Amino acid sequence: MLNTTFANAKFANPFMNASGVHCMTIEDLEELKASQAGAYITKSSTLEKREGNPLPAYVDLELGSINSMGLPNLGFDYYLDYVLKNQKENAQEGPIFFSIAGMSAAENIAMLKKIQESDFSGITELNLSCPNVPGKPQLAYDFEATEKLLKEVFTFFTKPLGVKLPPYFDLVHFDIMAEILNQFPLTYVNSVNSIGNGLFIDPEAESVVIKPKDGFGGIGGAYIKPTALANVRAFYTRLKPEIQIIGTGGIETGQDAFEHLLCGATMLQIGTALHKEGPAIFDRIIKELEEIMNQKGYQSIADFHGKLKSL
Amino acid sequence: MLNTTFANAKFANPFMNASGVHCMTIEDLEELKASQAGAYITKSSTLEKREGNPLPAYVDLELGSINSMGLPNLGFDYYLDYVLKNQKENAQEGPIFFSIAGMSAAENIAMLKKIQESDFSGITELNLSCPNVPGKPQLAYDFEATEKLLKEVFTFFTKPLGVKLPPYFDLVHFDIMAEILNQFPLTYVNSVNSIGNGLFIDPEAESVVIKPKDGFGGIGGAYIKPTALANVRAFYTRLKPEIQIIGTGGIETGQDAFEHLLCGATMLQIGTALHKEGPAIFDRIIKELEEIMNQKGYQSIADFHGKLKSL
Numbered sequence: 001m002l003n004t005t006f007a008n009a010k011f012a013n014p015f016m017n018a019s020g021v022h023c024m025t026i027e028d029l030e031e032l033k034a035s036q037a038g039a040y041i042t043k044s045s046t047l048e049k050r051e052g053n054p055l056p057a058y059v060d061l062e063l064g065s066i067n068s069m070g071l072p073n074l075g076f077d078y079y080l081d082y083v084l085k086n087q088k089e090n091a092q093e094g095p096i097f098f099s100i101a102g103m104s105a106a107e108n109i110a111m112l113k114k115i116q117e118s119d120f121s122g123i124t125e126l127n128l129s130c131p132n133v134p135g136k137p138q139l140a141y142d143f144e145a146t147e148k149l150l151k152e153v154f155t156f157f158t159k160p161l162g163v164k165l166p167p168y169f170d171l172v173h174f175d176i177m178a179e180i181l182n183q184f185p186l187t188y189v190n191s192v193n194s195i196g197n198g199l200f201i202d203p204e205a206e207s208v209v210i211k212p213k214d215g216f217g218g219i220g221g222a223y224i225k226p227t228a229l230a231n232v233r234a235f236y237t238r239l240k241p242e243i244q245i246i247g248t249g250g251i252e253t254g255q256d257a258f259e260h261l262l263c264g265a266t267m268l269q270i271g272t273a274l275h276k277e278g279p280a281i282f283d284r285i286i287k288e289l290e291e292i293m294n295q296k297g298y299q300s301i302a303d304f305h306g307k308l309k310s311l
Numbered sequence: 312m313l314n315t316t317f318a319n320a321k322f323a324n325p326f327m328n329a330s331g332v333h334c335m336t337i338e339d340l341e342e343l344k345a346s347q348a349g350a351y352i353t354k355s356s357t358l359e360k361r362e363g364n365p366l367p368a369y370v371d372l373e374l375g376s377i378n379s380m381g382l383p384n385l386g387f388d389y390y391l392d393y394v395l396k397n398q399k400e401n402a403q404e405g406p407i408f409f410s411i412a413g414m415s416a417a418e419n420i421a422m423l424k425k426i427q428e429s430d431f432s433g434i435t436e437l438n439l440s441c442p443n444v445p446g447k448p449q450l451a452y453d454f455e456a457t458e459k460l461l462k463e464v465f466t467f468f469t470k471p472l473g474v475k476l477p478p479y480f481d482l483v484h485f486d487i488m489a490e491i492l493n494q495f496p497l498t499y500v501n502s503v504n505s506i507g508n509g510l511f512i513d514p515e516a517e518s519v520v521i522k523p524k525d526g527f528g529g530i531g532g533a534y535i536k537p538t539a540l541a542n543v544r545a546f547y548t549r550l551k552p553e554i555q556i557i558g559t560g561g562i563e564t565g566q567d568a569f570e571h572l573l574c575g576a577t578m579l580q581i582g583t584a585l586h587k588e589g590p591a592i593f594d595r596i597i598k599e600l601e602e603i604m605n606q607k608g609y610q611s612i613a614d615f616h617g618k619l620k621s622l
């Protein structure tokens with residue numbers, strides 16, 4: 001019922017992990033492969049291995065999560081070797097996704113060049129929105145810098161590429177970004193990364209709950225679903241059909257998934273909920289979405305994809 | 312216990328209504344005056360009376376609210392005439408706040424000039440963040456336009472003035488805005504207005520829940536507290552001490568209030584919670600905050616104001 005076509009590839013269902021969650025090591029990735037997830041993506045990588053910010057850096061909240069991980073990752077070479085090797089094996093339905101988050105334009109270009117030259121046949125996700133790198137703002141909030149980077153990327157990168165975007169809150173910003181992105185042979189847009197620089201306080205201790213950046217961190221979970229759905233929908237009505245969408249943000253139940261799909265998302269990523277529940281979440285949410293479809297008499301996602309009604 | 316000094320004026324407590332909530336008519340305002348609120352503010356006004364966006368425009372949500380009112384208001388002259396006659400009665404402890412949200416820079420300048428020329432002795436709040444007027448983005452997301460407007464404003468406005476700001480999610484943005492604001496003799500900054508252009512969906516009807524702008528509206532309530540607290544704290548550590556802060560966003564309990572004060576807010580505004588509960592909320596939240604202070608052995612807000620601890 002959930003069979004999905006995305007990036008000219010076929011997936012059993014639209015569910016995936018969100019980059020950064022349960023995808024740090026080969027062991028984590030193999031657990032996602034064994035789960036019911038339709039597809040999975042690697043932790044955003046940098047050219048070299050990176051330690052990350054001081055702990056505590058992640059905290060579970062009643063309405064979601066707050067985090068300032070700081071891009072801890074095992075490095076580009078580590079992830080490229082895993083994907084190449086799981087590619088040669090033909091042991092899964094649908095390609096693996098590879099996320100990169102260079103700490104400079106040159107770094108992103110270097111990793112993209114390596115992917116282009118390698119035998120990698122999967123999908124790449126360029127992260128333009130990490131809100132937890134001290135001194136390095138979200139690139140996608142700088143429209144000029146974003147367009148400049150993408151123009152250089154497309155002068156040589158021919159493989160499937162998507163961009164992970166931060167949430168926008170002004171309609172003109174959606175217009176500007178859509179006009180920048182529509183000029184490229186981009187495969188997809190993934191909205192949204194965490195709501196940047198939020199704060200959570202322990203009132204009894206009168207202090208913040210994470211160590212990095214004086215307690216400021218990316219917000220995920222139920223707190224952000226309204227923003228996530230809005231971003232998915234706003235881009236769905238502005239992007240050229242050639243650019244599909246991956247919806248991310250506040251997905252915990254089949255109903256949350258149904259809502260993202262109504263908005264126009266094709267693939268769906270789970271962050272916070274997966275962090276709390278583990279890979280078993282995929283079997284649960286798949287069953288919940290199928291039940292919603294059964295009650296409505298839908299046998300395919302096409303029966304409601306992007307059909308959100310206005311009043 | 313809650314006695315507060317703000318804008319060189321004395322207030323019984325820091326609580327106020329948030330502009331837009333329970334402050335449309337003289338009757339609403341008189342009800343706020345009779346309540347236990349330390350101060351109150353008028354609905355943002357425009358030069359001409361406005362009907363507002365088509366209904367339904369406001370919906371109560373489990374985690375907050377979504378709205379696209381569209382600045383319905385009785386017009387600048389209506390509110391000015393009211394505050395001018397009330398001021399003369401000397402019937403309350405502390406000035407009334409007057410909010411303005413002109414459709415254009417020219418409209419804001421015209422209203423500010425009328426306030427300057429009038430005998431108004433209260434406090435004015437310039438709203439640079441309404442996210443619900445079709446085709447009119449939040450001015451405060453355009454740093455150049457914001458600085459330009461404020462420079463003209465201060466060539467003539469000498470009365471107390473604060474600015475209502477939209478939420479920011481990137482530290483560099485707080486730096487830019489702080490640099491801009493610190494060059495002016497502003498009285499305060501009010502963070503934050505609703506999280507703009509969010510979306511809420513009724514999964515059973517497969518439809519949005521508000522009529523304007525295809526269902527996109529400002530988000531308030533529990534959903535936005537992490538963002539609201541972060542904005543209050545980020546400006547508290549960046550603004551010159553002459554510019555105080557009013558904290559707005561997700562305040563429903565004494566604990567929420569305590570958190571805003573710990574961040575650096577001096578006055579506190581309640582929107583969504585007041586919309587749902589009515590003016591009786593002030594008596595409830597005041598007692599909740601005093602109980603928190605009593606348990607901690609605090610006898611004044613100064614005992615913890617801005618004392619949020621980092622790890």
Ligand SMILES: Cc1cc2nc3c(=O)[nH]c(=O)nc-3n(C[C@H](O)[C@H](O)[C@H](O)COP(=O)(O)O)c2cc1C
Binds near residue numbers: 021044058193219273
């Ligand atoms: C602990 C943690 C680490 C994350 N790491 C990444 C990352 O490396 N790359 C990326 O694009 N997003 C990262 N994200 C953001 C997610 O991919 C996702 O966009 C976000 O958590 C919003 O989804 P949610 O509401 O399901 O949590 C991370 C989120 C969390 C909580």
Ligand SMILES: Cc1cc2nc3c(=O)[nH]c(=O)nc-3n(C[C@H](O)[C@H](O)[C@H](O)COP(=O)(O)O)c2cc1C
Binds near residue numbers: 412531532
């Ligand atoms: C129905 C409604 C009308 C509002 N009208 C205004 C307005 O005229 N001017 C303004 O500055 N803010 C307005 N706001 C925003 C609030 O003042 C407040 O910033 C927002 O709701 C965040 O606070 P909350 O979490 O307590 O709701 C409005 C909010 C709502 C829900």
Ligand SMILES: O=C(O)c1cc(=O)[nH]c(=O)[nH]1
Binds near residue numbers: 020044068127133
């Ligand atoms: O690793 C991180 O800090 C991180 C990166 C990113 O893109 N998003 C997030 O929430 N955290």
Ligand SMILES: O=C(O)c1cc(=O)[nH]c(=O)[nH]1
Binds near residue numbers: 378379443
């Ligand atoms: O009247 C409105 O639509 C409105 C104005 C504003 O500044 N904020 C908000 O949430 N609504």
Ligand SMILES: [Mg+2]
Binds near residue numbers: 035036
């Ligand atoms: Mg599997």
Ligand SMILES: [Mg+2]
Binds near residue numbers: 343344345347348
């Ligand atoms: Mg009173």
